Amino acid sequence: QGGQVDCGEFQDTKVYCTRESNPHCGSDGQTYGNKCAFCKAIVKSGGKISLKHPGKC
Structure with missing residues (x-):
């Protein structure tokens, strides 16, 4: 929230990313290779997106 790996896209508050490759299949439907990839x-969709899966779908 101002001193974290705060993805400055920050449409939400929980938008922080990984230094690792932690895949996420967002509730946007999409799968992102890491959380950083999942930030944007x-x-x-508003920051309000959540995760379905740690990992891909």
Whole structure:
């Protein structure tokens, strides 16, 4: 929230990413290779997107 790996896209508050490759299949439907990849993707639909799967779908 201002001193974290805060994905400055930050459409939401829980938008922080990984330094690792932690895949996420977002509730956006999409699968992202890591959480960082999922940040903008949270941003995709308001920040309000959540995760379906740790990993891909």
